[PDB]
Coordinates of C-alpha atoms and ligand atoms in Angstrom, one line a residue:
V582 CA 5.6 18.4 -16.6
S583 CA 8.2 19.0 -13.9
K584 CA 9.8 16.4 -11.6
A585 CA 8.8 15.9 -8.0
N586 CA 11.4 16.3 -5.3
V587 CA 11.5 12.8 -3.8
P588 CA 14.5 12.6 -1.4
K589 CA 16.3 9.4 -0.6
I590 CA 16.4 8.9 3.1
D591 CA 18.7 6.4 4.8
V592 CA 16.3 4.9 7.3
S593 CA 18.7 2.4 8.8
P594 CA 19.1 4.4 12.1
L595 CA 15.5 3.7 12.8
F596 CA 16.4 0.1 13.4
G597 CA 19.1 1.0 16.0
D598 CA 19.6 2.8 19.3
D599 CA 21.4 6.0 18.3
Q600 CA 18.6 8.4 19.3
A601 CA 20.1 11.5 17.8
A602 CA 20.6 9.8 14.5
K603 CA 16.9 8.7 14.6
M604 CA 16.0 12.3 15.1
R605 CA 18.0 13.3 12.0
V606 CA 16.0 10.7 10.0
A607 CA 12.8 12.0 11.5
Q608 CA 13.6 15.5 10.4
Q609 CA 14.0 14.3 6.8
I610 CA 10.7 12.5 7.0
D611 CA 9.1 15.7 8.4
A612 CA 10.5 17.8 5.5
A613 CA 9.4 15.4 2.8
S614 CA 6.0 15.0 4.4
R615 CA 5.5 18.8 4.4
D616 CA 6.8 19.1 0.8
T617 CA 5.5 16.7 -1.9
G618 CA 4.6 14.0 0.5
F619 CA 6.9 11.3 -0.9
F620 CA 10.3 10.0 -0.1
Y621 CA 12.4 6.9 -0.9
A622 CA 13.4 4.8 2.0
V623 CA 16.9 3.4 1.4
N624 CA 19.1 1.0 3.4
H625 CA 15.9 -0.8 4.3
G626 CA 17.4 -4.3 4.6
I627 CA 14.8 -6.0 2.4
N628 CA 15.8 -8.2 -0.6
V629 CA 13.6 -6.4 -3.1
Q630 CA 15.2 -8.2 -6.1
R631 CA 13.9 -11.5 -4.7
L632 CA 10.5 -9.9 -4.2
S633 CA 10.3 -8.8 -7.8
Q634 CA 11.6 -12.2 -9.1
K635 CA 9.1 -14.3 -7.0
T636 CA 6.2 -12.0 -7.9
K637 CA 7.1 -12.2 -11.6
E638 CA 7.2 -16.0 -11.5
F639 CA 3.8 -16.1 -9.9
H640 CA 2.2 -13.5 -12.3
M641 CA 3.6 -15.2 -15.4
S642 CA 2.6 -18.8 -14.4
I643 CA -0.8 -18.6 -12.8
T644 CA -3.5 -19.9 -15.2
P645 CA -7.0 -18.7 -16.0
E646 CA -8.3 -21.7 -14.1
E647 CA -6.4 -20.7 -11.0
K648 CA -7.4 -17.1 -11.2
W649 CA -11.1 -18.0 -11.1
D650 CA -10.4 -20.3 -8.2
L651 CA -8.8 -17.4 -6.2
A652 CA -11.0 -14.6 -7.5
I653 CA -12.5 -12.0 -5.2
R654 CA -16.3 -11.7 -5.2
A655 CA -16.3 -8.9 -7.7
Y656 CA -15.2 -11.5 -10.3
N657 CA -16.6 -14.7 -8.8
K658 CA -20.0 -14.8 -7.1
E659 CA -19.2 -18.1 -5.4
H660 CA -16.6 -16.3 -3.2
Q661 CA -18.8 -13.9 -1.1
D662 CA -16.3 -14.0 1.8
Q663 CA -13.5 -12.5 -0.5
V664 CA -13.9 -8.7 -0.5
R665 CA -10.2 -8.0 -0.1
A666 CA -8.0 -11.1 -0.4
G667 CA -7.6 -13.0 -3.6
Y668 CA -7.1 -12.5 -7.3
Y669 CA -8.3 -9.4 -9.2
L670 CA -8.6 -10.4 -12.8
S671 CA -7.7 -8.6 -16.0
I672 CA -10.3 -8.2 -18.7
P673 CA -8.5 -8.5 -22.1
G674 CA -9.6 -5.7 -24.3
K675 CA -11.0 -3.6 -21.4
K676 CA -8.9 -3.8 -18.3
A677 CA -5.1 -4.3 -18.4
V678 CA -4.2 -4.5 -14.7
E679 CA -4.5 -7.6 -12.6
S680 CA -3.4 -8.2 -9.0
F681 CA -3.3 -10.5 -6.0
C682 CA -4.0 -9.2 -2.5
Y683 CA -3.3 -10.9 0.8
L684 CA -3.7 -9.9 4.4
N685 CA -2.3 -10.7 7.8
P686 CA -1.3 -14.4 7.8
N687 CA -2.4 -14.6 11.4
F688 CA -6.0 -14.3 10.2
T689 CA -7.0 -18.0 10.4
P690 CA -10.2 -19.8 11.4
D691 CA -8.9 -19.6 14.9
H692 CA -8.7 -15.8 15.0
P693 CA -11.6 -14.2 17.0
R694 CA -12.1 -11.6 14.3
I695 CA -12.6 -14.3 11.8
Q696 CA -14.9 -16.2 14.2
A697 CA -16.9 -13.0 14.7
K698 CA -17.0 -12.3 11.0
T699 CA -15.8 -8.7 11.6
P700 CA -15.6 -6.7 8.3
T701 CA -12.2 -6.2 6.6
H702 CA -10.9 -9.5 8.2
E703 CA -10.5 -12.5 5.9
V704 CA -8.5 -15.7 5.6
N705 CA -6.0 -15.5 2.8
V706 CA -6.5 -17.7 -0.2
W707 CA -3.5 -19.3 -1.9
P708 CA -2.7 -21.2 -5.1
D709 CA -1.8 -24.9 -5.1
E710 CA 1.6 -25.3 -3.4
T711 CA 2.7 -27.9 -6.0
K712 CA 1.8 -25.6 -8.9
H713 CA 3.5 -22.6 -7.3
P714 CA 6.3 -24.0 -5.2
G715 CA 7.5 -21.7 -2.4
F716 CA 5.1 -18.8 -3.4
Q717 CA 3.0 -18.8 -0.2
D718 CA 6.2 -19.1 1.9
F719 CA 7.8 -16.2 0.2
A720 CA 4.7 -14.1 0.3
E721 CA 4.1 -14.6 4.0
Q722 CA 7.8 -13.9 4.9
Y723 CA 7.6 -10.8 2.7
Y724 CA 4.6 -9.6 4.7
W725 CA 6.7 -9.9 7.9
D726 CA 9.9 -8.4 6.3
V727 CA 7.9 -5.3 5.2
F728 CA 6.0 -5.2 8.5
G729 CA 9.4 -4.8 10.2
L730 CA 10.4 -2.0 7.9
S731 CA 7.1 -0.3 8.3
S732 CA 7.3 -0.5 12.1
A733 CA 10.6 1.4 12.0
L734 CA 9.3 4.0 9.5
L735 CA 6.4 4.6 11.9
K736 CA 9.0 5.3 14.6
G737 CA 10.4 8.0 12.3
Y738 CA 7.0 9.5 11.7
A739 CA 6.2 9.6 15.4
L740 CA 9.5 11.4 16.2
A741 CA 9.0 13.7 13.3
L742 CA 5.7 14.9 14.8
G743 CA 7.3 15.4 18.2
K744 CA 5.9 12.2 19.8
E745 CA 7.5 9.3 21.5
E746 CA 8.7 6.7 18.9
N747 CA 6.0 4.2 19.6
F748 CA 3.1 6.6 19.2
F749 CA 2.0 4.9 16.0
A750 CA 3.8 1.6 16.1
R751 CA 2.1 0.6 19.4
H752 CA -1.1 0.2 17.3
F753 CA 0.7 -1.8 14.6
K754 CA 0.7 -5.4 15.8
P755 CA 1.2 -8.8 14.2
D756 CA -1.9 -10.2 15.9
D757 CA -4.4 -7.7 14.5
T758 CA -3.0 -5.5 11.8
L759 CA -5.3 -5.0 8.8
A760 CA -2.2 -4.2 6.6
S761 CA -2.3 -5.7 3.1
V762 CA 0.2 -6.6 0.3
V763 CA -1.0 -6.3 -3.3
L764 CA 1.1 -7.8 -6.1
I765 CA 0.0 -5.7 -9.2
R766 CA 0.9 -6.7 -12.7
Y767 CA 0.8 -3.9 -15.3
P768 CA 1.3 -5.7 -18.7
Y769 CA 2.8 -4.9 -22.0
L770 CA 0.0 -5.2 -24.6
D771 CA 0.3 -4.8 -28.4
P772 CA -2.2 -3.4 -29.3
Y773 CA -2.9 -1.8 -26.0
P774 CA -6.7 -1.3 -25.8
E775 CA -7.8 2.3 -25.6
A776 CA -10.6 1.1 -23.3
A777 CA -8.0 0.5 -20.6
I778 CA -6.6 4.1 -20.9
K779 CA -8.3 7.0 -19.1
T780 CA -7.7 10.6 -20.1
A781 CA -7.1 13.1 -17.4
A782 CA -8.6 16.6 -17.3
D783 CA -5.1 18.0 -18.3
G784 CA -4.9 15.5 -21.3
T785 CA -2.5 13.0 -19.7
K786 CA -3.2 9.4 -20.5
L787 CA -3.6 7.4 -17.2
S788 CA -4.0 3.9 -16.1
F789 CA -5.4 4.9 -12.7
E790 CA -7.0 8.3 -11.8
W791 CA -6.1 10.5 -8.9
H792 CA -6.6 9.3 -5.4
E793 CA -5.4 9.5 -1.8
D794 CA -4.3 6.2 -0.2
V795 CA -6.5 4.5 2.3
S796 CA -3.7 3.8 4.9
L797 CA -1.7 5.3 7.7
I798 CA 1.3 5.1 5.4
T799 CA 2.0 3.2 2.2
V800 CA 5.3 1.3 1.6
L801 CA 5.7 0.7 -2.1
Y802 CA 8.1 -1.3 -4.3
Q803 CA 7.9 -0.6 -8.1
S804 CA 9.9 -2.0 -10.9
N805 CA 12.0 0.4 -13.0
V806 CA 9.3 2.1 -15.1
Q807 CA 8.4 5.7 -14.4
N808 CA 4.6 6.1 -14.0
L809 CA 3.7 7.9 -10.8
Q810 CA 2.7 11.5 -10.5
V811 CA 2.0 13.6 -7.4
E812 CA -0.4 16.6 -7.5
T813 CA 1.0 20.0 -6.4
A814 CA -0.5 23.4 -6.6
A815 CA 1.4 23.9 -9.8
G816 CA 0.1 20.7 -11.3
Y817 CA 1.2 17.1 -11.5
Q818 CA 4.9 16.2 -11.1
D819 CA 6.6 13.0 -12.1
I820 CA 8.0 10.7 -9.4
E821 CA 11.2 9.1 -10.7
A822 CA 11.4 5.4 -10.5
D823 CA 13.8 3.5 -8.2
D824 CA 13.7 -0.3 -8.1
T825 CA 16.1 -0.6 -5.2
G826 CA 14.2 1.6 -2.7
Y827 CA 10.8 1.9 -1.2
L828 CA 8.5 4.8 -2.1
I829 CA 6.8 6.0 1.1
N830 CA 3.8 8.3 1.5
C831 CA 1.1 9.1 4.0
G832 CA -2.5 7.9 3.7
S833 CA -5.7 9.7 4.7
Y834 CA -5.7 8.3 8.2
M835 CA -2.4 10.2 8.8
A836 CA -3.9 13.4 7.3
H837 CA -6.9 13.1 9.6
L838 CA -5.0 12.6 12.8
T839 CA -2.5 15.4 12.1
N840 CA -5.2 17.9 11.1
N841 CA -3.7 17.8 7.5
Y842 CA -0.2 18.8 8.8
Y843 CA 1.0 15.7 6.9
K844 CA -1.3 15.6 4.0
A845 CA -2.2 12.4 2.1
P846 CA -0.7 13.3 -1.3
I847 CA -3.0 13.0 -4.3
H848 CA -1.3 10.8 -6.9
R849 CA -2.1 9.0 -10.1
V850 CA -0.7 6.5 -12.5
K851 CA 0.4 7.4 -16.0
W852 CA -0.3 5.0 -18.8
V853 CA 2.9 3.4 -20.0
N854 CA 2.9 0.4 -22.4
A855 CA 5.5 -1.6 -20.5
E856 CA 5.5 -4.8 -18.4
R857 CA 6.0 -3.7 -14.8
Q858 CA 5.2 -4.3 -11.2
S859 CA 3.6 -2.3 -8.5
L860 CA 3.8 -4.0 -5.0
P861 CA 2.3 -1.8 -2.3
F862 CA 2.1 -2.6 1.4
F863 CA -0.7 -0.6 3.0
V864 CA 0.2 0.1 6.6
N865 CA -3.1 -0.4 8.4
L866 CA -3.7 -0.6 12.2
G867 CA -6.1 -2.8 14.1
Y868 CA -9.8 -2.8 13.8
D869 CA -10.4 -1.0 17.1
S870 CA -7.3 1.2 16.9
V871 CA -8.0 4.9 17.7
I872 CA -5.3 7.6 17.6
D873 CA -6.3 10.9 19.2
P874 CA -5.9 13.7 16.6
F875 CA -3.6 16.7 17.2
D876 CA -2.3 19.7 15.4
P877 CA 1.5 20.2 15.5
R878 CA 1.0 23.8 14.3
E879 CA -0.7 24.9 17.5
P880 CA 1.1 25.4 20.8
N881 CA -1.5 23.4 22.8
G882 CA -1.5 20.8 20.0
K883 CA -5.3 20.8 20.2
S884 CA -7.4 19.7 17.3
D885 CA -11.2 19.7 16.8
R886 CA -11.1 16.6 14.6
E887 CA -12.9 13.6 16.0
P888 CA -11.1 10.4 16.9
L889 CA -11.7 7.7 14.3
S890 CA -11.6 4.0 14.7
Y891 CA -9.3 2.5 12.1
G892 CA -11.6 -0.4 11.1
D893 CA -14.5 1.8 10.3
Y894 CA -12.2 4.2 8.5
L895 CA -10.7 1.3 6.4
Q896 CA -14.1 -0.2 5.5
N897 CA -15.4 3.1 4.4
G898 CA -12.3 4.0 2.5
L899 CA -11.9 0.8 0.5
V900 CA -15.5 1.1 -0.7
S901 CA -15.1 4.7 -1.6
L902 CA -12.0 4.1 -3.7
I903 CA -13.8 1.4 -5.7
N904 CA -16.7 3.8 -6.4
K905 CA -14.5 6.7 -7.6
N906 CA -11.5 5.0 -9.2
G907 CA -13.3 1.7 -10.2
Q908 CA -13.0 -1.9 -9.4
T909 CA -9.3 -2.9 -9.7
Ligands
IP1_2368 C1 -1.0 3.8 -7.0 C2 -1.0 2.4 -6.3 C3 0.3 2.1 -5.7 S1 -2.2 2.6 -4.9 C4 -3.6 2.4 -6.1 C5 -4.8 1.4 -5.8 N1 -5.1 1.0 -4.5 C6 -6.0 0.1 -4.2 O1 -6.7 -0.4 -5.1 C7 -6.2 -0.2 -2.8 C8 -6.1 -1.7 -2.6 C9 -6.5 -2.2 -1.2 C10 -6.4 -3.7 -0.9 N2 -7.2 -4.5 -1.9 C11 -6.9 -4.0 0.5 O2 -7.9 -4.6 0.7 O3 -6.1 -3.5 1.4 C12 -4.0 0.4 -6.7 O4 -4.1 -0.7 -7.0 N3 -3.1 1.4 -7.1 C13 -1.6 1.3 -7.2 C14 -1.2 1.3 -8.6 O5 -1.9 1.3 -9.6 O6 0.1 1.2 -8.8
FE2369 FE1 -2.0 5.1 -4.3

């Protein structure tokens, strides 16, 4: 098993006004997106140590009672409005992973998409403030911190594709973004149940089988335990861990709109018996967002691919990933 080339890219110019320096970042994004599909964003300005510490405190103090109270409908039939946001329970002896997903904090009963009951929009559910002091405040602020990083990364991606820097980011707005944060706990277990370990075709023991991300891009923090692998023509390659940076990759919406020029890399999760964290931010656009596809390989840039509304893409995509990879 070889090692994936995952370059560290200083993205700090994307927050500034030095346009040539932005173009040099964009070139690095282009190169990584055309190679393995992954890079590490460094000098991102987010306190990822606090993120890991607050997430750990939550994961390790939430009780079985609180997990039922917050559970998505896959685990609690009383919560039919919770398809996305809420707690995803572990099943001791069967399913090791557990997680907590939340959406746009601006999705409230006042929001017209909530009033209209549009699919993929939900009001976040939260534990008791007194039992989890500061957790909701931290989690909402983290959403906006990583939103700000993601907006800048989208400027880099736009420039990399020869577009104006707001080509993607203009569709990424606090008032309607369908972006999500997921706080995933992968536990240490002794004994680790074999029922929670899948075996790949090539013999590798996995926690999560191959998939493409349902996103425009994915902005991922992981603790310092190597686990991820990216598929290449020569087979799967290990992505080295870095708990100070963000692992960035394109999702299938980006592959669609670039005519596969920037592929959505196929990746999977090796089984590792180690307590660790996987904290993705899925950069999703608004429900009605449509980006006209193009092909940077053709002089005219023309693509035959149909424009796709993001909301319908996201609804279809999240159902599909459950069916193939299983309920997480
Ligand atoms: C490889 C990943 C980072 S991505 C992969 C997998 N992804 C998902 O389940 C999509 C979650 C979507 C979310 N509930 C929403 O409504 O927006 C997961 O979890 N996996 C992570 C993992 O196992 O670390
Ligand atoms: Fe993924």
